Amino acid sequence: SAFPVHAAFEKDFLVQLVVVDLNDSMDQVAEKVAYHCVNRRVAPREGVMRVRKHRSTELFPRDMTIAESGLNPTEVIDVVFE
Amino acid sequence: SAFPVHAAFEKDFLVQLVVVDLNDSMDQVAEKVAYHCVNRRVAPREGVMRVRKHRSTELFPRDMTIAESGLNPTEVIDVVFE
Amino acid sequence: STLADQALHNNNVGPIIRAGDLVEPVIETAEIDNPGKEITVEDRRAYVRIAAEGELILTRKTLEEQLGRPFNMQELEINLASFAGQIQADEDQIRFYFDKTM
Amino acid sequence: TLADQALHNNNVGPIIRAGDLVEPVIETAEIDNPGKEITVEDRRAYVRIAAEGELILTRKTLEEQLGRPFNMQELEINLASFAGQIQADEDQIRFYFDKTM
Amino acid sequence: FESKKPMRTWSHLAEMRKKPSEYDIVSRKLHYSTNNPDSPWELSPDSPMNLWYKQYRNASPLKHDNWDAFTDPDQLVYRTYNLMQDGQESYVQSLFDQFNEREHDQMVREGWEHTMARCYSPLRYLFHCLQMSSAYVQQMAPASTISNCCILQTADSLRWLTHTAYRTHELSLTYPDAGLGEHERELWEKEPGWQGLRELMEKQLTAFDWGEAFVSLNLVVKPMIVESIFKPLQQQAWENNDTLLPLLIDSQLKDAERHSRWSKALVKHALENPDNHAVIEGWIEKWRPLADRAAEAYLSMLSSD
Amino acid sequence: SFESKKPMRTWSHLAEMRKKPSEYDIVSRKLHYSTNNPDSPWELSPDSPMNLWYKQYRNASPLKHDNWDAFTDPDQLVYRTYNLMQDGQESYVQSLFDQFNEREHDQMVREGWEHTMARCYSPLRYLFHCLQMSSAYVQQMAPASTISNCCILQTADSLRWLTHTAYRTHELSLTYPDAGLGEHERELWEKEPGWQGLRELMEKQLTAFDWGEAFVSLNLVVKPMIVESIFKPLQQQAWENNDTLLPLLIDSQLKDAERHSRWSKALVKHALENPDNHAVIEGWIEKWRPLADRAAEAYLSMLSSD
Amino acid sequence: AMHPRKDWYELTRATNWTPSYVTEEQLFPERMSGHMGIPLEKWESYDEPYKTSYPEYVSIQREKDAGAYSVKAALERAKIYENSDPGWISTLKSHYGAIAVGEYAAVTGEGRMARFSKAPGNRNMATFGMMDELRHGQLQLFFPHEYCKKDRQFDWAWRAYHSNEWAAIAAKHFFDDIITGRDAISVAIMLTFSFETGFANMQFLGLAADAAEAGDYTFANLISSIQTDESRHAQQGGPALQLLIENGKREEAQKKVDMAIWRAWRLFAVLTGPVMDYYTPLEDRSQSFKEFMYEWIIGQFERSLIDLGLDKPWYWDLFLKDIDELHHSYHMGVWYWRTTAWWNPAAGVTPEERDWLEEKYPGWNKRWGRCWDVITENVLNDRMDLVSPETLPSVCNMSQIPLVGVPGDDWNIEVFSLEHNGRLYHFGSEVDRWVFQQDPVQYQNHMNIVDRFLAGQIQPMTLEGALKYMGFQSIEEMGKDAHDFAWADKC
Amino acid sequence: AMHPRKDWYELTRATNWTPSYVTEEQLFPERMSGHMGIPLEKWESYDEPYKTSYPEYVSIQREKDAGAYSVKAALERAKIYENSDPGWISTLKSHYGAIAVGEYAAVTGEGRMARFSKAPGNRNMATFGMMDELRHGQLQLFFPHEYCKKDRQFDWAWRAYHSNEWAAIAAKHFFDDIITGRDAISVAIMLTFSFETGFANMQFLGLAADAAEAGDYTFANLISSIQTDESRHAQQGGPALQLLIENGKREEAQKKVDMAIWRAWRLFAVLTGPVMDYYTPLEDRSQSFKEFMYEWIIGQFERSLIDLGLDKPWYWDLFLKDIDELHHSYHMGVWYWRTTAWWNPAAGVTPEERDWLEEKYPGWNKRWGRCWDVITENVLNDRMDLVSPETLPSVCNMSQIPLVGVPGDDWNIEVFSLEHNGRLYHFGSEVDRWVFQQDPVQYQNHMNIVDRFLAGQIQPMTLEGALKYMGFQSIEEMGKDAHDFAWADK
Ligand SMILES: [Fe+3]
Ligand SMILES: [Fe+3]
Ligand SMILES: [Fe+3]
Ligand SMILES: [Fe+3]
């Protein structure tokens, strides 16, 4: 079910509302954010998209879901590359 | 000896003051008028330059002098081609 | 000249209004206060020539309505740069008119 | 360092909007503040006129440079802004700072 | 979304049958703080100013479903107000200049300067209360066309105040031994003839409901001031060879009568809602006693030796 | 041949002033070109009838100065400031008219005042129109634009007073329709003995065509006599008769009059720079004064008349 | 309460009386008054159709000036002087120099009427007329004055009427003849029906349309405001004319208006015609000079004269031919003799302009074009001594403007001469000779500037001597090609 | 004769009295007055340094309007709307829409002072302040009204504050916080010392300078005239500030001014910044936004505050870095979400404009440059779906403006989040979070537009439902690229 996050994509100029699902993996999250960023204001590039709590050091496991991750609805996340 | 006339040269747009000489022939009067018109506002042409009383039919003789013509000072003359 | 004769034999009367906030309200007033006359307008940017045939009325009440603020007839000269026709002005209206038909 | 130098100034004086008060105010500033350099920055829509620490405009001088009778209150038709603190009366307006930076 | 043509005026005005006037264009429907009942201002719905407005504007028992349809009967805008008042005020100023040239003040009846010091020059406190009160009705009125009449009325009260200031000082120059310019605050605070007026105004300034504030200011306080202060002062001046004051006050009465005109028009707009008639008359019955006592005490003091 | 020179900050004729030229300097000074060529004031035949008229009545006047153009209006009025000032005074007078009518002022005057007014006041429109005509004459004859400009404004002032008088004559007629108000002024001006000194003075004043003498008779003799023997005694009579509007009206008209007297005085002072003008001005003043005195005496005696 | 103007207006003009201590003829002498023997009483039916009264006059004129000056002050840094085409700048220079002190002279015209008209309503309206012309003179000195510091040619706003420059003499001859040099009733019908309801509309409203296209709103706004006064005080003419006609003087009124209109025509052909068809940049030309003439002079003004009871002037057909031809030669005369002007004439003959000229004036290139061909080839080939003259143009003894005709392929030029009292006069048209003959005493001893040159009054008797005589004080003052010949490059 | 103002002025402001029939605190309640407990008698030394009095005011204001309206009338045919650059016309639309009805709101802040300030000179000068703001509101509705017939976007001169469009909500959040939503003494020092002597000079004089260069004199002349009023009624602030310092309230005053300046800066960065560096045609850029900022806000305004006795704000260095970066990203967000604007944002990134931007902001092309390249490529390839968004930006719970940062080569972006009373808020800066913490009861149950989005208040829950909610009434009203992407040709 719907899970709103605020997401900042690496190299974009802003944070956007992106509504993901409760059982989305981090991979699936990264891709739902990419949709609104890459090839719109951000060059495509090679590498693996990772999701983290905003500004934090530790990346979430790619295969971890939103539910398992402990994020709250409307929290802020960064989508960044390895 | 100085003799003021007002002269209108053929194809020009105005009448000018030209000071000629009492003993000028009409050929010389004509040349003194042309100096102020031909190559200024009037294209040069072949032909013989003649002098008449303004708007008159009769030409003065080419050799006749100002003295001999009867013109009074400051009358109007035309300088035309035959 | 045909052209001259045609220019001269006109019966156009009405105000010449200088560029400003009275242009459109005088145009509109001309149409409203002269029902049934055709109003012609020539726009020269610095002024507008407004005319009808034979007679053209501008009433103070309509001009006030179209202008949108209180207005006295006398104030019209702030903007009336010229006019065609003879003039008859009073506290309620101004009339531009010809005595002759040409 | 650019910001420090922009902030650490003692310029006071009128910002005059485009119109007929610009040159008479400049001239009045020069005359009523002898021994001060008057700077002038012209932005077309307005002109920024300043001196260091204190800048005085008297009504008498202004009226003379303007060319017509003039009361000090009328200055606000054209005084669009100002640098410094202000003290205004019937005879003059004074732009000034209490501190030296 | 559909495609639509440009309108000749504001969207809110395009249903008008006539061409909108200067007044319509610059004055109508400008309070946006009436759009959302929960949140007058763009803040927490519970911020102190939002609670103030929900209580003292929105919950007013004086109601109408379209306060914004009110129209100033004079249709004044800032520009025409200044044109008009620059005419009246420079007329009054010219009177001041010429009556001073004639030394009018030396020629008033013996003792007049004492009646002025006691009955005229403290008016500056009364007129400043009207100024304060007018500003309150302005900030609380539920339509900009109402608020605009209050702004102009606020300026007019300051005009009157400034008249009084100027004339108190001017009179003192001819009569330096009467307390002119020196004792007005004491008089306002302690002289009995001023105490009914000051009590009335202090309470009036603490009626915070907008309809109550409007009714008490414009329908009770201000007409009382016209009939019990302005006109009797003109009569008295006439009896004491003061020919300046009656002319000054006639100019102030033009303002006061304009304030009555837009007031009455607001009353008539309000009475469209049949409930409003008991609301307004109740506020009138409530304040009139206060106002009548104010007039009575003023007039005994004006009457006496 | 020709020098190079740089742009000047003002008109070439003003560019050596010590001071920055004022609005008044820029727009008022040295504008009569008709004084440049003493044989041909106007650009016509030297002997055209108007050239003959200006050679005789301006150029040959006994009153002389080699720089009339240095004359300066002490009020330094231009068209723009004149209108600013008079829109102020006149809208004040119009506001008095309105208010005093609201208070039905004219009903409260003392019994019979309307008859004095019809006799002594309302025919002032003829007198004032004479000063208007006479001011226009000085304007057109005077040898400097700065002088002519004070006369233009004085001409407008005369018409202002004339219009006041019209407006009041009519307004008063509405309260007193049986006094001749607005009906019999022409006959009074022509037949009434109180008016005959004034009318004779004006008729002869209006036929003095020397610019110098026109100026002296109008402004140094006729107009100060109207202030002293007509305006102020009328203020004095209206006071006795419970007319409070007229002293106010006349006080505004007197401001105009004092301004006429100030530029007049300043022009005498300029003219006295040449010592021969002292005799010429006093000559003219002695010549015209008895006529003025007589005009006043006859008016005052009519006004008193019970 | 206030009583409305119509109930007291009659008393403002009940000011005629029967004089006794001087005669009527002494009070109103015919040389100053021009009453033509018509008795006072008759003048009392004069009824000005455009009324004003003192309180409204000062209020409304106060607001007119507030606007004129505030628009000026707000645009004082629009870069007009700096970004304007130099032909537009020249138009400003010649307008101010030719008009400003002529307005101030017009005060004397109105003053003539204010004192010596037998019509009481004329005397009052002329008093506002005096005030109006004062306004016009002061505005048209104040506005160019700020350009002094940029360009000495702007000094001629003040200086021109004080000079003997030939165009200024043409200006003063016209204004002294129609305005300051005649009796009151002559002014009433010649000034109001030649300049004020006629050629003023060309110079102050036609030119305003061009000014607005060129983006000079300070100017457009000023001269259209000026013209609002004129539309009022020019209405003193119609009632004067109507009285002349009702009292048997129609023939002499016809003569006067006929003469004044021709005189005005010749002067404004030299001022306005070159501005509209040559100096004003081509993109800013709202209409051609001749189109403007048909709108304002034939369509409006002459139509109004007919409505008031006059006939077309007898020279109608000459006039219409003159509208097609004369200003093109006046332009050429002014430009070729540019050094005698206080402005910089624009040649106005790039190919683009010549196409426009050809379209507005079919046959233009086979006429004036022949002259401009030759001029242009000399500029291109750097033969500059041939684009400056070495003698004087012959000058009309009425209009003071050079004698000109149609040049090029159907050359036609004519001078109308006259011996009179031992002197030979030359005139630029049948009409100008006829004017002279209507009133010889007005003109006969006048000497035009070329007459003066030949009689020894211009020393030395050279072109440079003439230039000093005309009042130029420095090299920068004299006219030059407006674009320094840069137009040649487009040819 | 007339007596000079200095001789009778004191009496015009001798109007405090000791109340008796009600208490002082009833007459001047603290929540409307803000006197901070300072008793009546102390407020009588208040001395406005820029005085006026009623006969002068109406006379001089009559002349100001005469000039403003005569210049408008005289230029009605200049063809600005026709010959102007479309980015210039968008400047006008956004100015009038953002400002006009805000001016009219400002009347209520002056009215608050006129009734509830305990300083008598404040109450009189605020009465002229009321009159002034009425002027400013009526002018700025009268002037655009003539463009209604040309373009529906000008309806927004009137309509913006009546809508829930996001930039209007931001204007209203600021003005309702600083002007209409606070007590009299807070208005006295927060309105006068953030907008009136501060950022109003950017929008009304900096922009005049650009309008003069663009040849729009009607506009230049109008807004410089407006600011002459402000320069007078804004001088109500210094004496209020001086009293608060003298009576021990320096810290409270400092905090109120610190907060108002920051809130003003965030609004004027989205309103004025894009105008001066992108909408205004290159040749008409008298100075950059940053250069104007250094002139008006650092050189003049902040220096005046120091002279009055305050310190540099605590966030000084954060503020200077914001100057170099914030408005570039605000521009990009307004542009990329231009359908949600009532004006037509100009992208302002042709090559020559990208060079000017690189000279005024070294490193521009490595940052915002990187986003503009992606967008440019998509326009040249006709992937227009890719230059229109499908989601909403995340928005600051204080300024109501999108949360942004520096994009591209040194990507850097920070949201300052805050838990409070069971809710999570997000802010665009440290200062914006600090402001919230200064006065939670002012802000805590406010919901920004995205809060409303997520809570089901915007139906349907899509960009298009959002546009209906924001109050657009037609397709023409929604923002488009000002040049219809013609810049892409360059
Ligand atoms: Fe004129
Ligand atoms: Fe005229
Ligand atoms: Fe404002
Ligand atoms: Fe403000």
Please give, one letter per residue, the 3-state secondary structure of E73-116: CCCCCHHHHHHHHHHHHHHHHHHHHHHHHCCHHHHCCCCHHHHH
Cβ G397 vs Cβ G446: under 8 Å: yes
Mutate to test the interface with H, among E7, E26, E94 (most CBs of H within 10 A): E26
Helix (H, G, I), strand (E, B), or coil: what is residue G423?
A: strand
Instruction: Tell which residue, H93, H111, H135, H298, has the closest CA to residue H228.
Output: H135
Q: What is the CATH number of domain D1-101?
A: 3.90.56.10
What is the distance between the alpha carbons of residues A20 and A29, in angstroms, rounded to a whole number?
A: 6
Size of interface B-G (CB pairs under 8 A): 99
What is the distance between the alpha carbons of residues H448 and H426, in angstroms, rounded to a whole number?
A: 10
Which residues from G are below 8 Å from D44, CB to CB? 77
Beta carbons of H298 and D6 less than 8 Å apart:
yes
Annotated binding site of G: 103, 133, 136, 196, 230, 233
Tell me if chain G has a CB within 8 Å of the CB of H413. Answer: no
Residue G438 CA, chain-centre distance (Å), reads 21
Tell me if chain C has a CB within 8 Å of the CB of E21. Answer: yes
Size of interface A-H (CB pairs under 8 A): 99
Instruction: Tell which residue, G243, G260, G251, has the closest CA to residue G301.
Output: G260
E210: left (phi over 0), alpha (psi -120 to 50) or beta: alpha
Burial E251-275 (b: 16+ CB within 10 A, else e): bbeebbebbeebbebbbebbeeeee
DSSP H/E element including G334: helix G316-336
User: Helix crossing, G86-116 with G250-274: angle to 10°?
Assistant: 160
Cβ D19 vs Cβ H70: under 8 Å: no
Q: What is the CATH number of domain E1-305?
A: 1.10.620.20
- Residue that the structure tokens 């009133």 belong to: G439
Going from the C-alpha of F302 to that of each of F195, F290, F299, G486, H264, the distances in angstroms are 8, 18, 5, 81, 78
Give G97 Cα–ligand 2 centroid separation in angstroms.
17
What is the distance between the alpha carbons of residues C97 and G303, in angstroms, rounded to a whole number?
A: 12
What is the distance between the alpha carbons of residues G383 and B39, in angstroms, rounded to a whole number?
A: 10
Sign of the C-alpha dihedral computed for residues G420, G424, G428 and G430 taken in this order? positive
Instruction: Tell which residue, F153, F159, F150, has the closest CA to residue F131.
Output: F159
* DSSP letter, residue H402: B
How close is the nearest chain F Cα to the Cα of D97, in Å?
Answer: 32
User: Helix crossing, G120-145 with F145-175: angle to 10°?
Assistant: 140
* Token pair listed for H446: 């406010």
Instruction: Tell which residue, F120, F112, F130, has the closest CA to residue F193.
Output: F120
* Token pair listed for G273: 């015609």
Tell me if chain D has a CB within 8 Å of the CB of F20. Answer: yes
What is the distance between the alpha carbons of residues C54 and C37, in angstroms, rounded to a whole number?
A: 10
How close is the nearest chain E Cα to the Cα of H102, in Å?
Answer: 10
- Residue that the structure tokens 């100015």 belong to: H95
Cβ B58 vs Cβ B40: under 8 Å: no
- Determine the residue type at E65: D
DSSP H/E element including D41: strand D39-42
Domain locations in chain E as residue ranges: 1-305
For residue H134, the ligand closest to its alpha carbon is 3
Cβ G208 vs Cβ C49: under 8 Å: no
Going from the C-alpha of H451 to that of each of A4, E33, H396, the distances in angstroms are 11, 21, 10
Beta carbons of H209 and D45 less than 8 Å apart:
yes
What is the distance between the alpha carbons of residues F37 and F295, in angstroms, rounded to a whole number?
A: 40
Annotated binding site of H for Fe cation: 103, 133, 136, 196, 230, 233
Q: Which partners does chain A have (≥3 C-beta pairs < 8 Å)?
A: H
Burial G67-99 (b: 16+ CB within 10 A, else e): bbbbbbbbbebbebeeebbbbbbbbbbbbbbbb
Q: What domains, with CATH codes, occur in chain H?
A: 1-490 (1.10.620.20)
How many other C-beta atoms can be found within 10 angstroms of the C-beta atom of residue G437? 12
- Determine the residue type at G241: L
Annotated binding site of G for Fe cation: 103, 133, 136, 196, 230, 233
Which residues from H are below 8 Å from C20, CB to CB? 73-74, 76
**Long-range own/partner contacts, residues H20-24 (CB < 8 A, 24 or more apart):** H20/E189, H20/E198, H20/E199, H20/E202, H21/E198, H21/E199, H21/E202, H21/E203, H22/E202, H22/E203, H22/E205, H22/E206
Give G199 Cα–ligand 2 centroid separation in angstroms.
11
* DSSP letter, residue G234: G
Alpha helices in H160-288 (DSSP H): 166-175, 184-190, 200-201, 207-213, 217-233, 237-246, 250-274
Instruction: Tell which residue, H28, H162, C68, H114, has the closest CA to residue E147.
Output: H114
Helix (H, G, I), strand (E, B), or coil: what is residue A37?
A: coil
Instruction: List F residues 75-134 in contact with D (Cβ-Cβ < 8 A).
Output: 81
Size of interface D-F (CB pairs under 8 A): 16
What is the distance between the alpha carbons of residues C56 and H3, in angstroms, rounded to a whole number?
A: 54
What is the distance between the alpha carbons of residues H383 and H145, in angstroms, rounded to a whole number?
A: 37
Q: What is the DSSP string of H435-481?
A: HHHH-HHHHTT---HHHHHHTT-SSSSSHHHHHHHHT--SGGGS---
Beta carbons of G74 and D19 less than 8 Å apart:
yes
- The residues, ordered by sequence, that sit 6+ positions from G445 with a Cβ below 8 Å of its Cβ are F45, F46, F47
Q: What domains, with CATH codes, occur in chain A?
A: 1-82 (3.10.20.270)
Which residues from G are below 8 Å from F50, CB to CB? 176, 180-182
DSSP H/E element including C95: strand C93-97
DSSP H/E element including D95: strand D92-96
Instruction: Tell which residue, B70, B63, B56, B1, has the closest CA to residue B29.
Output: B63
- Chain A touches chain D, with at least 3 Cβ pairs below 8 Å, answer no
Going from the C-alpha of H205 to that of each of D59, D79, E66, H227, the distances in angstroms are 25, 12, 39, 8
Sign of the C-alpha dihedral computed for residues F269, F275, F277 and F281 taken in this order? positive
- Determine the residue type at C86: Q
Burial H45-61 (b: 16+ CB within 10 A, else e): ebebebbbbbbbbbbbb
Domain locations in chain C as residue ranges: 1-102
Domain C1-102, CATH homologous superfamily name and number: Monooxygenase component MmoB/DmpM (3.90.56.10)
Which residues from B are below 8 Å from G378, CB to CB? 39-40
What is the distance between the alpha carbons of residues G173 and G165, in angstroms, rounded to a whole number?
A: 12
How do B76-81 and B2-9 pair as beta strands?
parallel
Hey, which bits of chain B come out as E strands? 2-9, 15-21, 49-53, 76-81
- Determine the residue type at H229: D
- Tallying the residues shown for chain H, one arrives at 490
* Token pair listed for F210: 């020397």
How many other C-beta atoms can be found within 10 angstroms of the C-beta atom of residue F187? 13
- The residues, ordered by sequence, that sit 6+ positions from G238 with a Cβ below 8 Å of its Cβ are C86, G49, G192, G308
- How big, in percent rounded to 5, are the helix, strand and coil portions of chain C? 30, 35, 30
Tell me if chain H has a CB within 8 Å of the CB of E106. Answer: no
What is the distance between the alpha carbons of residues H81 and H84, in angstroms, rounded to a whole number?
A: 6
Residue H42 CA, chain-centre distance (Å), reads 33
- The residues, ordered by sequence, that sit 6+ positions from F108 with a Cβ below 8 Å of its Cβ are F242
* DSSP letter, residue F205: H
DSSP H/E element including A8: strand A2-9
- Chain H touches chain A, with at least 3 Cβ pairs below 8 Å, answer yes
- Residue that the structure tokens 């008079």 belong to: F86
The verdict on domain F1-306 having CATH code 1.10.760.10 is no
- The residues, ordered by sequence, that sit 6+ positions from B68 with a Cβ below 8 Å of its Cβ are none
- The residues, ordered by sequence, that sit 6+ positions from H95 with a Cβ below 8 Å of its Cβ are H203, H207, H223, H271, H275
Nearest residue, CB atoms, H67 vs list G70, G77, G212: G70
- The residues, ordered by sequence, that sit 6+ positions from H385 with a Cβ below 8 Å of its Cβ are none
* Token pair listed for G58: 């000062």
What is the distance between the alpha carbons of residues G472 and G456, in angstroms, rounded to a whole number?
A: 19
Hey, which bits of G339-480 come out as E strands? 416-420, 423-427
Which residues from E are below 8 Å from F86, CB to CB? none
